[PDB]
Design a protein around this ligand. Structure first.
Ligand SMILES: [Zn+2]
Lengths: 48, 197, 49, 136, 52, 189
RNA sequence: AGAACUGGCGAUGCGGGAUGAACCGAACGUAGAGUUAAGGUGCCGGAAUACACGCUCAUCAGACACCACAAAAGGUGUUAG
RNA sequence: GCAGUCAAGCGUUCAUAGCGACAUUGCUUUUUGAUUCUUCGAUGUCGGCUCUUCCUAUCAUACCGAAGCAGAAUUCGGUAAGCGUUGGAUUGUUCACCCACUAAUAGGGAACGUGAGCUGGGUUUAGACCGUCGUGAGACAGGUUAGUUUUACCCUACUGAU
């Protein structure tokens, strides 16, 4: 996680009062590089 | 008489097993009970369900982690019935209940080892034909078990891996009977037949 | 007297044992949680200026 | 809530609770309205109900035309001072809390509205919009 | 428009019944002994109301 | 009292062979074929002819014997359905609002949907059981015919229909609408 | 709460009724063998998952008197009459 | 306080849709009473505030049945206590009455829950005033006003923590 910001977008929720209107919403930004795979692990079913 | 006993629990009744187990294990015999999801119990399903839902009701109010631990697995329902029959609060009940090893399905070690049956608890012999009986897997699942669909996927592999063994053995011994039946017409056997062998 | 930012009557008598259900002080935060149905509004490219 | 409401509203910051004494814009002789209740307004222990813009209240006049006072009457609040948030983002507020006398069917008693009026009331109560001269 | 050749059919499943005075349960018109256990399989029945 | 022997018997018209092993009936015929499980009942079966079968219970005592004739009818209904077949003729009824019924292939199997059940918008669908064929009358276009071999499938499906096309929160003495069975017969006679 | 006759608890342990001042059995020197009381023999629990004729299957079964509760009225559920 | 059984009748006709007298069977311990076993080398005694949990004899909400159910609205009943069940004037009040919203404004228990948790309006010490009683000191379950509310660092429980 990094932090938050504020945006604007036109709506497509039809029949609402704010259809074809714009709004303001708050979003979180999360920094998200590439992970790298190093392994694989195998799980199997048991009665436990 | 054998050092360890392996009890197939199919078509058995719970409280009529556990009074044999709880005495044979208090007298010094090691017992394992296997295929406990195939156990049977008197009474209709709804009735034996309510007799569990009136157990889940009983938990220590001020903190329920202190109270009656309602186990949902058949291996543990049977153990409950036995723990009740045993003075588990002493070093004799404790020592006994460590002579016991209960399972669902038949794991490998007790797969290739012979199984037995307690006739004074078989539903077949005991119960009237026409009475309703309830199966512990359906019950456990209905009160919050999870691993029913696994045991059936494993025990079937057990069965198809066992049926081939049985066919192998049978198609071996049908000739042992022939080559010992071809050898029973001598004096060695006409003399034993008088002794009773 | 003896505080206001608290609870009175943490329990009645004969249960005689304070309950798991009653409000009591302790840690706040550093708990694990899973919120759901969070929509995505942009998936970001790092090589873009 | 829908006792005369044409449409349905968004949540607005609940400004003025009961006990509030807000002006009266209409030309019905009144001067202030004492809120005694709110339509909607669910229950919680020790919580006193509140009124937002566009909400109906039930009210009691304290100053104006003794023909009116000493009785309850429905009312409609059309300005409030609590900064509230519009979906377009901005926080707006008025300089005074003010209301209107009304009947349960959402109609009015007066012929005008002395002052500005909130879009969040006027879209909803249509008989207020026809008698308003200004909207925000 | 129900054409009473068919109104008779709808009434076989709706209004040709008998009701317990003790549990208010739909029972058939020919039967005694309310099938529900909470009543005690009683015999106090009546016909269902069809005229006024 | 506990009796000694209560036995019923089951005729068998030709073309039919009734195979039993461990209380699992299997019947065949011109129309088709059928099976049934009766492990939950204690009952025997013997073959005195290819033309009939003898079913028997022993001491019993007034509870097993009531299931005896029941079993007898079940097997007899089965033979009847695999020799002739069953036909259930349901019919529509309404006052103002017609019921618009059709068959529809959903993602899985067939269904039968009904619309305008008293002006409702809920398109209420019903599965078709596997043992059922299904059609509409043509002499009058306001019926429907379920049909098959197994009555406990056909009739259960018809009841599944007329149980969902039932009005709620209204006077049923007045709102005698929906669909209802009208005739039970076969598809040979 | 208050009287009559007797037996007890009090002042009395012991085996049984899970537990209990009074109930059942039975009254106590220290010990050993045998036999029983009342109560019990699925397991906890020592002792028959004994034998026999039947009744009951309860979606709040029922199970050691005192004792720790249960009625009027009903049921084609079943059994016998 | 709650419920049930007969059912004479009410119920435009229609005992039992709903109700239902004369009688009669019980349940409850949230009433009041009776009793006096425990507690007088002290179990802190009204109400409210706060807070949790439980019960069902369900006010509402869910699915159903029945009506003297056309619809709408209502009543009777059932499974069901999962979820909720208010803001305020007057009163110390329990209790009560009204205004108002509401889906609804249901009843009850937990040492008549809860005072080392609060308050201390009331009651129940001492000061004082009136009325009535009494020769008088003084009485009143009659009214009025003012009147010290102590301690947890222990064990357990609980919340969190190594
Ligand atoms: Zn009934």
């Amino acid at each position: 996680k990094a932090g938050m910001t504020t945006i604007v977008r036109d709506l497509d929720r039809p029949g609402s009062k704010f259809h074809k209107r714009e709004v303001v919403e708050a979003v979180t930004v999360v920094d998200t590089p590439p992970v790298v795979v190093v392994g694989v692990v195998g799980y199997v079913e048991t009665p436990r | 008489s054998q050092p360890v006993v392996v009890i197939d629990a199919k078509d058995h009744l719970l409280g009529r097993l556990a009074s044999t187990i709880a005495k044979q294990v208090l007298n010094g015999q090691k017992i394992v009970v296997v295929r406990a999801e195939a156990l049977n119990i008197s009474g209709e399903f709804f009735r034996n369900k309510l007799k569990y839902h009136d157990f889940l009701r009983k938990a220590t109010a001020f903190n329920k982690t202190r109270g009656p631990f309602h186990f949902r697995a058949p291996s543990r329902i049977l153990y409950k019935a036995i723990r009740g029959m045993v003075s588990h609060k002493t070093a004799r009940g404790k020592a006994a209940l460590e002579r016991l090893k209960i399972f669902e399905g038949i794991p490998p070690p007790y797969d290739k080892k012979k199984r037995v049956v307690v006739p004074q608890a078989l539903r077949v012999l005991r119960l009237k034909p026409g009475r309703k009986y309830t199966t512990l897997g359906k019950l456990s699942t209905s009160v919050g078990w999870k691993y029913e669909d696994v045991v059936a996927k494993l025990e079937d592999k057990r069965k198809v891996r066992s049926a081939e063994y049985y066919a192998k053995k049978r198609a071996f011994t049908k000739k042992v009977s022939s080559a010992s039946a071809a050898a029973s017409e001598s004096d060695v056997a006409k003399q034993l037949a008088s002794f009773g062998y | 007297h003896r505080g206001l930012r608290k609870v009175a009557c943490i329990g009645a008598w004969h249960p005689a044992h304070v309950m798991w259900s009653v409000a009591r002080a302790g840690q706040r935060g550093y708990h694990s949680r899973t919120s759901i149905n969070h929509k995505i509004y942009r998936v970001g490219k790092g090589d873009d200026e | 809530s829908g006792n005369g409401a044409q449409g349905t509203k968004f949540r607005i910051s609940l400004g003025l609770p009961v006990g509030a004494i807000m002006n009266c814009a209409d030309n019905s002789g009144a001067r202030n309205l004492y809120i005694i209740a709110v339509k909607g307004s669910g229950s919680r222990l020790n919580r006193l109900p509140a009124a937002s813009l566009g909400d109906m209240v039930m009210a009691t006049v304290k100053k104006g035309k003794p023909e009116l006072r000493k009785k309850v009457m429905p009312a409609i609040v059309v300005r409030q001072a609590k900064s509230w948030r519009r979906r377009d983002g901005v926080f707006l507020y008025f300089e005074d809390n003010a209301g209107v006398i009304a009947n349960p069917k959402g109609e009015m008693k007066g012929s005008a509205i002395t002052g500005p009026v909130g879009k969040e009331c006027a879209d909803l109560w249509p008989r207020v919009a026809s008698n308003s001269g200004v909207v925000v | 428009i129900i054409e009473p050749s068919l109104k008779a059919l709808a009434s076989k499943y709706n209004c040709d019944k008998s009701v317990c005075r003790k549990c208010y349960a739909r029972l058939p018109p020919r039967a005694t002994n309310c099938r529900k256990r909470k009543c005690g399989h009683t015999n106090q029945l009546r016909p269902k109301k069809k005229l006024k | 009292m506990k009796y000694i022997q209560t036995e019923q018997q089951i005729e068998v018209p030709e073309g039919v062979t009734v195979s039993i092993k461990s209380r699992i009936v299997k019947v065949v015929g011109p129309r088709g074929t059928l099976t049934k499980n009766l492990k939950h009942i204690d009952v025997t079966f013997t073959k005195v002819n290819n033309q009939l079968i003898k079913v028997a219970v022993h001491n019993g005592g007034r509870k097993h014997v009531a299931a005896l004739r029941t079993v007898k009818s079940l097997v007899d209904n089965m033979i009847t359905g695999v020799t002739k077949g069953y036909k259930y003729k349901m019919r529509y009824v309404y006052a103002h609002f017609p019921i618009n019924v059709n068959i529809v292939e959903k993602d899985g199997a067939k269904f039968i949907e009904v619309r305008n059940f008293l002006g409702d918008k809920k398109i209420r669908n019903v599965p078709v059981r596997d043992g059922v064929t299904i059609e509409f009358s043509t002499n009058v276009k306001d019926e429907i015919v379920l049909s098959g071999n197994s009555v406990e499938d056909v009739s259960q499906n018809a009841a599944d229909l007329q149980q969902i096309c039932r009005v709620r929160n209204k006077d049923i003495r007045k709102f005698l609408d929906g669909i209802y069975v009208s005739h039970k017969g076969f598809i040979t006679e």
